[PDB]
Enzyme design. Structure first.
Site, PDB file in Angstrom:
ATOM      1  N   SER A   1       0.775  -1.238   0.000  1.00 32.14           N
ATOM      2  CA  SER A   1       0.000   0.000   0.000  1.00 32.14           C
ATOM      3  C   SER A   1       0.813   1.299   0.000  1.00 32.14           C
ATOM      4  O   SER A   1       0.236   2.377  -0.133  1.00 32.14           O
ATOM      5  CB  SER A   1      -1.019  -0.013   1.134  1.00 32.14           C
ATOM      6  OG  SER A   1      -2.038  -0.962   0.855  1.00 32.14           O
TER       7      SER A   1
ATOM      8  N   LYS B   1       0.135   3.761  -2.646  1.00 34.12           N
ATOM      9  CA  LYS B   1      -1.000   4.673  -2.556  1.00 34.12           C
ATOM     10  C   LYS B   1      -0.542   6.119  -2.424  1.00 34.12           C
ATOM     11  O   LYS B   1      -1.165   7.021  -2.970  1.00 34.12           O
ATOM     12  CB  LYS B   1      -1.916   4.283  -1.395  1.00 34.12           C
ATOM     13  CG  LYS B   1      -2.623   2.968  -1.646  1.00 34.12           C
ATOM     14  CD  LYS B   1      -3.357   2.430  -0.435  1.00 34.12           C
ATOM     15  CE  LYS B   1      -4.047   1.128  -0.801  1.00 34.12           C
ATOM     16  NZ  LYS B   1      -4.376   0.285   0.379  1.00 34.12           N
TER      17      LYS B   1
ATOM     18  N   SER C   1      -5.851   3.523   4.057  1.00 35.87           N
ATOM     19  CA  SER C   1      -5.303   2.530   3.129  1.00 35.87           C
ATOM     20  C   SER C   1      -6.410   1.778   2.397  1.00 35.87           C
ATOM     21  O   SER C   1      -6.285   0.591   2.080  1.00 35.87           O
ATOM     22  CB  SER C   1      -4.386   1.555   3.865  1.00 35.87           C
ATOM     23  OG  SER C   1      -3.474   0.970   2.956  1.00 35.87           O
TER      24      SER C   1
ATOM     25  N   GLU D   1      -5.216  -3.174  -6.211  1.00 42.18           N
ATOM     26  CA  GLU D   1      -5.367  -3.786  -4.896  1.00 42.18           C
ATOM     27  C   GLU D   1      -6.545  -4.753  -4.913  1.00 42.18           C
ATOM     28  O   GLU D   1      -7.579  -4.440  -5.504  1.00 42.18           O
ATOM     29  CB  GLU D   1      -5.620  -2.696  -3.854  1.00 42.18           C
ATOM     30  CG  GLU D   1      -4.416  -1.832  -3.527  1.00 42.18           C
ATOM     31  CD  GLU D   1      -3.468  -2.502  -2.555  1.00 42.18           C
ATOM     32  OE1 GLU D   1      -3.489  -3.746  -2.440  1.00 42.18           O
ATOM     33  OE2 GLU D   1      -2.698  -1.782  -1.897  1.00 42.18           O
TER      34      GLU D   1
ATOM     35  N   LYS E   1       2.900   6.290   4.934  1.00 40.60           N
ATOM     36  CA  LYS E   1       1.984   5.344   4.324  1.00 40.60           C
ATOM     37  C   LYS E   1       2.490   3.939   4.579  1.00 40.60           C
ATOM     38  O   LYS E   1       3.623   3.588   4.239  1.00 40.60           O
ATOM     39  CB  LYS E   1       1.832   5.574   2.819  1.00 40.60           C
ATOM     40  CG  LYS E   1       0.844   4.608   2.175  1.00 40.60           C
ATOM     41  CD  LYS E   1      -0.591   4.962   2.528  1.00 40.60           C
ATOM     42  CE  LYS E   1      -1.544   3.799   2.308  1.00 40.60           C
ATOM     43  NZ  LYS E   1      -1.396   2.742   3.346  1.00 40.60           N
ATOM     44  N   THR E   2       1.635   3.134   5.187  1.00 39.71           N
ATOM     45  CA  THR E   2       1.977   1.765   5.500  1.00 39.71           C
ATOM     46  C   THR E   2       1.616   0.876   4.336  1.00 39.71           C
ATOM     47  O   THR E   2       0.852   1.264   3.456  1.00 39.71           O
ATOM     48  CB  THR E   2       1.149   1.266   6.684  1.00 39.71           C
ATOM     49  OG1 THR E   2      -0.239   1.465   6.384  1.00 39.71           O
ATOM     50  CG2 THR E   2       1.521   2.022   7.947  1.00 39.71           C
ATOM     51  N   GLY E   3       2.152  -0.334   4.354  1.00 36.85           N
ATOM     52  CA  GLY E   3       1.698  -1.369   3.459  1.00 36.85           C
ATOM     53  C   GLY E   3       2.003  -2.714   4.055  1.00 36.85           C
ATOM     54  O   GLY E   3       2.865  -2.840   4.919  1.00 36.85           O
ATOM     55  N   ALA E   4       1.280  -3.721   3.593  1.00 36.07           N
ATOM     56  CA  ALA E   4       1.559  -5.098   3.951  1.00 36.07           C
ATOM     57  C   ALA E   4       1.209  -5.968   2.766  1.00 36.07           C
ATOM     58  O   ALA E   4       0.194  -5.757   2.097  1.00 36.07           O
ATOM     59  CB  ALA E   4       0.769  -5.514   5.175  1.00 36.07           C
TER      60      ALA E   4
END
Length: 256
Positions: free
Chosen positions: A39, A42, A97, A133, A201-204
């Site tokens: 993410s 984004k 997110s 996504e 901004k996080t993501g996994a």
């Protein structure tokens, strides 16, 4: 040795690049190792959205359907009947997110191909937007689809948020969104000192991929742009946010 210690402790691979824009000092640890960007894309997606649209333009109302809502749509699922403005979509994408938000913006800007084209334009030769996504989260070790590196994400984020790929009002919009992210509390934010602002901004993604990219605003001095990327050996591996927070601490110590 400190980053390697964390890798050891968390049975994970760390991908780290930090630029203190106030001293041009850098912190690097596997900065050119590829990770599924998840993410974090984004952030870069909204950057491109902002490049394309006046701030007023972001008031265009986007209608979508339940087809567009795939897995994780905390905001978009609630407005499926009434639509959302591009700004509201950017808000949802960055701060919650929201996957559908990302997807609708990505479509707006011309799809993964257009995002990749705009990133190449800014001189990011490494980030590979290919999918929407949550498909983009399905990245195997060695695959380059939907991957980037800590160096590339930092460099690209900096270009949009701090440099001149956006005019100041749009940069501010992007920064305000990321500053008010709600998903990153236990990541980069958990690794900066008090009074440091974080726009993240996080993501996994698959293989226990756990990422956070940020601009960090010290009490005094210019921003630090940081990407902390991580992945693990096993496809269904769980991640530990603590790794990102701890890696951030090591970065901040190095920049001090």
């Amino acid at each position: 040795d400190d980053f390697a210690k964390l890798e050891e402790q968390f049975d994970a691979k760390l991908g780290i690049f930090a630029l203190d824009t106030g001293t041009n000092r850098t912190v690097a640890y596997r900065p050119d190792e590829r990770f599924a960007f998840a993410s974090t894309i984004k952030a870069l997606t909204v950057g491109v959205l902002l490049q394309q649209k006046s701030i007023e333009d972001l008031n265009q109302r986007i209608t979508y359907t339940r087809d567009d809502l795939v897995n994780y749509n905390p905001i978009t699922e609630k407005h499926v009947d009434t639509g959302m403005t591009l700004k509201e979509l950017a808000d949802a994408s960055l701060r919650y997110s929201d996957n559908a938000a990302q997807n609708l913006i990505l479509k707006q800007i011309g799809g993964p191909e257009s995002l990749k084209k705009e990133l190449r334009k800014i001189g990011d030769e490494v980030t590979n937007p290919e999918r929407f996504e949550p498909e983009l989260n399905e990245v195997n070790p060695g695959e380059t689809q939907d991957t980037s590196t800590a160096r590339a994400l930092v460099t690209s984020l900096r270009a949009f948020a701090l440099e001149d790929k956006l005019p100041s009002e749009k940069r501010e919009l992007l920064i305000d969104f990321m500053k008010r992210n709600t998903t990153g509390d236990a990541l980069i934010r958990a690794g900066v000192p008090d009074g440091f602002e974080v726009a993240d901004k996080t993501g996994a993604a698959s293989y226990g991929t756990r990422n956070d990219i940020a601009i960090i605003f010290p009490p005094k001095g210019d921003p630090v742009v940081l990407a902390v990327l991580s992945s693990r050996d096993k496809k269904d591996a769980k991640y530990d946010d603590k790794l990102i927070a701890e890696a951030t601490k090591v970065v901040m110590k190095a920049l001090n």
